[PDB]
Design a protein around this ligand. Structure first.
Ligand code: ATP
Ligand code: ATP
Ligand code: ATP
Ligand code: ATP
Ligand code: ATP
Ligand code: MG
Ligand code: MG
Ligand code: MG
Ligand code: MG
Ligand code: MG
Lengths: 343, 343, 343, 343, 343
């Protein structure tokens, strides 16, 4: 069958909820972005940054998790022979309590997340304020200053040598007190990646575009991946969104499969084409239906757990500006050739 | 009987006042908001914020207490079994003495309230400045920097994993020195709710609307629940107000039950439809009557404890702007569809 | 007799002066406001703030003392049976040396005043900087940060459970530099009151009209009590003024009682209704007469120690302003009817 | 043959990728810059700085590696006879987390990198905070102040006496707070160089021109080497870039040798004549074509890993203004003669 | 002969290069400044500062070295009879990493440089924190405060009694943040030299002029020696430069003596008449010629190791700016006579 297993109807609601939660769909944009990210990670070729832009609902976190799992599986056969190697380390940036993005917490959290292997791996981190304990947890005291933590993290990264160092919610790097400090933060990240040779992937919303072009160097060593949403103007994206809706309604564990392609305009309006928004909206509707033990879904039920017009209106304003700034036209190439004198 | 028990007359005034205080009424808006909030808490589906608005004098705190008690009784068995579990952690915000919200005090208050289980549960939390004592209290020294407290709170929240984290009077998050820092505060809360995977519910007055829509990401991970007041234009709200007035009149522990629905215009004038304000008014009047040991109530006693015109005028000014901001019309849908191309 | 006992004549002038000083006459406004405040603090009913408004001449301080002594008398039988409870506690706001109101001194003085029971009650307060000493006093170290003092004061307030917290001279809280600082000061007071569940009565001059109406929350959770002065337009006010003056004349421990009701216009000119101003003026005049061992008092004796015109008009400017804002007319009532739709 | 070894086709993907990565091509600009740098390092003649300006993709780091290898090879036969001497020390500047460059970390890491000889070499550097350890690495405590580290570094430099002192990524020296502090930073570097008599070479992008001629005293002891890219207005640079493209496509380990000289305009468009960027582009294209096992490269394959037009557009903007500052014309010579009176 | 020794042609390049670098030419400006400095050093007569101004190229460091060597040779006969007497002690000024000149580092470096005789002198300096060691190099702990180190330096200076204290690049004293702090720095140096009675000679670039006559007390107690370069308007210095060029071309260790007299305008332009800059240029050109084994210096060879016109323009920009400050005319005499009334 092309949908949910029919046996799940006899099971109580918890297993149906879990099955719909763990189910993941494959759509052309996600597959394309995943292939591009894997190709970039496999051969960075002197590139230290991968800026993965995308709106809220594109699946950036799910893409990161899928890439992490696939990289771990790929590195497992070689990890059997070679040890002291982590395939991939992923940490999430923290929005600071103060007005400036603190780096000490970032360094210590990167050290914690990176260093959770089997205890057999001993590397005697630099600086005396960082050590192991009785429970295998990294001990970082307030004694150490930020450069000492940076040195310890650099040595640990060089020794472990992960394929890629994922940093989720990278927009939090923009919490600074000075405008030039915004470029200085990326310069610090570039130096960290240069002196350890570890590929850094930044996943964030469209406000990460403030890091897009600043200093030629940074630019040269940054790869831009756009996790674009499904637009309504292009019929192909509409067809893809309808196919996603059709497979979602096929995969809804209900006694009666509802009709969801009919109200595709509504869904879109309340999701803006983001697959994650559609997925969690359907999750809410299905949870309500299972709580009510209702054989099927109604538009009303969709209206109950939809997104407010004010919420979606703010979404499209940021998405419109994000895609406008990332719009590459053939006219732009003309100026580049004209400026280079190749016209 | 549908009213107060008759045997309370022989018992003295103090227990009658206690019965009236412990008495709670059910009205359609309260039950609707309660069921919506319970459905949202039962499954967040990628949401980290619930922005519950409403006037002051309504039922937000009582709704919170009812939700916590219901979830505790529901989780009861689970708790009884699997140990090291707290179903709900409910916290109120603190207005800072200075002009900037104190995140360190928020973190230490979260540590204090969250960790009050049986002493058997030990977790020797990260950072060396937080530990238990000889009386089971959590010891937090001033030497512990705020990020360290954040890390310890993150660990505790991750392990205990409450279903919902209430933040009462959340409008106190607006006490900031920088205008843009509002979004930074909300981002800090979102980052705290991200790595912990704990649903944050923000209880606030209409001042909380300053946080209602900042950035697309915060819009995605938030749901707006409006605890609307019983308006005067819609007849059904007037019928609900009269019904709750009659219900209050039935449960007044007096020798003679006063006639209360007749003077409903005065009650709406001095309460604006908020059930909490009316309960406060009737509590004051009943306390005065029981002090005088009089058989029944009168408009006079009502005017003595009535809210003055000036203070009631300011509330409606706040309520008028808050409801105007939160008013979603069919027209607002039209521009959203027109902008997206779904018109 | 209705006046002073005749045995005081043999006693020296000091004893007569002491008897007249500790004497406190009662007037209709005094007893009315006392009963209103007693009924308001007998049960707060979700109200955290009481705003006793009055000129610097009425009797706010003596009313506070009367309330404290009354509730202290009321709570003795329960205190004999239950320890670790204080009936009522109260302090006076400090005008700060610097620009900003110092919350550290306010918190430490509240803790000092509240925690003076018999030495048996040990509650091992939070914060290591707060404890007892060899002499039983509470020692507060300067190293203790303000939020720690706030938490300690909160724990003490919750444990001791006072009936009402008095803050005399509450207009001192207005020493702020920001327009919104004016409000989040009262917000901090409201957070302190809510988190402890303790009614906070604020006794202050007409400068407190600044704190009158700020936002719907503080407009609802506050009840305004106006200690109006005996005006000259109302014939009942004039009659009450003359009755109080006649009682004062009868209660003078003088060899021959003088006729005081004659210069009622002069007394109202130099006191404008404030009973306390008349009382301490008469104390001044009686002491001056007793210094010279004179059998009587003269118009020039009153003139020798009256209030000069330059100051006397100054309170009028403040008083007429506060009475203007605190005036609730029927026009305002009908304005609420039209705006809310109950016309 | 002038092309790649034809035996590589039997080898797997990893061997071919490694062979292509390890290939270093020789082109006239790199040759002339390398010869000039060799000549200026052979004898400084009262010079302490070598400023090597080069755009993002010019080969600065690989030139540093090549000159490091050549210096080590030339020092090798006398190194067998002479000890206590290192040929060359290579370091890279660190972008600081804070606003200003951190000299303490620079000094300690310079000591770390310089001090990695065999364990037999003992000097007993000044200050008690610096020593060896059981692993042979220098340990530097956090209690040593910056001047002490500077003195120890000076002693180490005067003892070892390296021929040159490489500071890669010297652009990070410009991160300061005070506008005039650039002069102070460069004077600190000059003072470090003077006492040790060690020629420093600073490698950085075109931003490094901020340190060019900011002081006459610093202007005397600095040598400006320009790592120019390949222009398009000059036919000679165009022909050189064509020849280098021919050499690259000649040595690509593929079954079918692709033709690349046709779209020399395309290759120049996305590389601006930079050699490292072109090499990285070809490395990524080879990796892509070798994952699919295609016997050749297709145009669209170049479009897959080509840098964004926005990235290349801005790189020209900073390069064009960078070359303008470095432009020397006959007009400047005439103004020098007129100012000097030599006209 | 007037040229270089002829047998060096058979010798390898290293010997010829060493002979050229160690050869020192004598020119009238150097001889005049040297004799003036020697006369001033023979007797200070109440002058505590010898300000030697000169461009970067005049030969300040070599003149200091020659003066120190001559004084050492003159004092050898007295040193043989009288021990514990260093004739001349000279240190270098340190450019500080921070914005403030570090006087502690200057004091400790002066102490370590001055205290380098054989171990027999056991002076037993003041302060407990300074003493000798096993290896003979004194050690100073960071615990020792700067003024105590200063007092120890005073005791050491008065005991040893050197003739002159040389400080190179004394303009490094100008790195402060307070505007008036220049006078404070100069007053500290004057005080130092005072109680010690040791003539302090300061050599630096033209920016040393910031402390020229900054106050009357320092103005009297200091004499200034100008290390003037060779100009072009006056034919005398032009002829002197021609003679210097002829001597250098006669002393070049080459088979054919190149004609440097034709391009005197060229060199002068690219050296501004500075003998040191010309010597370094000739050193670079001779090294290149020996590398090519060419029996001559071709013009283009001079252009290879010349200085950029941008560098030379910055040279002359600061040279002419300081010269007008250091220009004394008869016009400046008349007003001085007029102001004193001496006219
Ligand atoms: N292809 C997919 N199939 C199934 N679920 C998906 C898919 N893409 C996203 N989701 C859902 O989206 C949620 C994960 O968040 P997601 O990565 O979509 O967020 P994002 O908006 O890209 O990033 P952020 O967390 O920064 O806002 C999960 O509920 C997951 O089930
Ligand atoms: N439905 C209800 N039935 C009975 N009493 C109620 C009800 N709703 C509110 N109250 C009364 O209101 C008081 C609690 O405050 P309430 O929850 O109304 O505050 P709120 O205005 O929603 O919140 P806030 O303090 O943030 O302004 C109690 O006295 C409680 O008895
Ligand atoms: N009803 C009264 N009978 C007798 N004395 C009174 C009375 N009311 C006030 N007083 C006298 O007034 C003085 C106390 O000051 P009072 O409370 O009247 O001042 P206030 O202006 O109302 O307030 P505040 O203390 O803020 O200035 C005492 O001397 C007290 O004897
Ligand atoms: N002549 C060359 N032959 C082979 N590879 C080269 C050559 N020049 C540069 N590269 C490649 O360039 C990379 C080294 O970086 P490169 O020195 O080109 O950077 P840069 O732009 O000068 O400086 P930065 O790192 O500061 O941006 C390596 O991948 C190296 O293989
Ligand atoms: N008369 C001379 N004969 C030979 N070499 C000289 C002469 N004058 C200067 N030099 C050379 O100049 C260098 C010494 O630096 P010099 O004192 O000339 O520099 P400065 O620009 O005056 O001072 P500084 O750079 O210290 O501020 C040495 O290479 C030395 O050989
Ligand atoms: Mg996500
Ligand atoms: Mg409430
Ligand atoms: Mg008073
Ligand atoms: Mg490079
Ligand atoms: Mg010199």
């Amino acid at each position: 069958s092309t949908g949910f297993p029919l046996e799940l109807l006899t099971r109580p609601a918890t297993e149906r909820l879990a099955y719909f939660e763990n189910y993941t769909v494959a759509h052309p944009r996600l597959k394309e972005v995943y292939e591009i990210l894997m190709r970039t990670i496999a051969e960075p070729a002197g590139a230290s940054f991968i800026f993965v832009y995308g709106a809220s609902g594109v699946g950036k976190t799910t893409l990161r998790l899928r890439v992490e799992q696939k990289l771990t599986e790929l590195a497992l056969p070689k990890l059997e022979s070679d040890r002291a190697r982590v395939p991939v380390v992923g940490i999430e940036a923290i929005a600071p309590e103060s007005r400036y993005f603190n780096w000490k917490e970032y360094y210590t959290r990167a050290l914690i997340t990176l260093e959770e292997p089997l205890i057999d791996h001993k590397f005697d981190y630099g600086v005396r304020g960082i050590s192991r304990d009785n429970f295998g947890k990294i001990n970082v005291e307030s004694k150490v200053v930020a450069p000492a933590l940076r040195r310890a993290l650099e040595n640990a990264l060089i020794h472990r040598h992960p394929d890629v160092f994922f940093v989720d919610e990278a927009q939090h790097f923009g919490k600074v007190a000075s405008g030039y400090k915004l470029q200085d933060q990326l310069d610090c990240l570039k130096s960290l990646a240069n002196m350890t040779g570890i590929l850094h992937c930044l996943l964030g919303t469209y406000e990460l575009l403030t890091f897009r072009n600043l200093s030629g160097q940074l630019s040269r060593r940054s790869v831009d991946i756009h996790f674009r949403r499904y637009c309504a103007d292009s019929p192909e994206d509409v067809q893809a969104f309808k196919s996603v809706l059709l497979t979602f309604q096929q995969h809804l564990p209900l006694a009666e499969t509802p009709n969801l392609v009919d109200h595709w305009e509504y869904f879109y309006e309340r999701t803006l084409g983001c697959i994650g928004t559609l997925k969690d909206w359907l999750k809410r509707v299905l949870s309500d239906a299972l709580d009510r033990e209702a054989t099927t879904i109604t538009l009303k039920d969709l209206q109950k757990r939809a997104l407010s017009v004010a919420q979606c209106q703010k979404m499209f304003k940021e998405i419109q500006e994000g895609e406008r700034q990332l719009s590459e036209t053939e006219a732009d190439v003309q100026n580049l050739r004209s400026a280079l004198g190749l016209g």
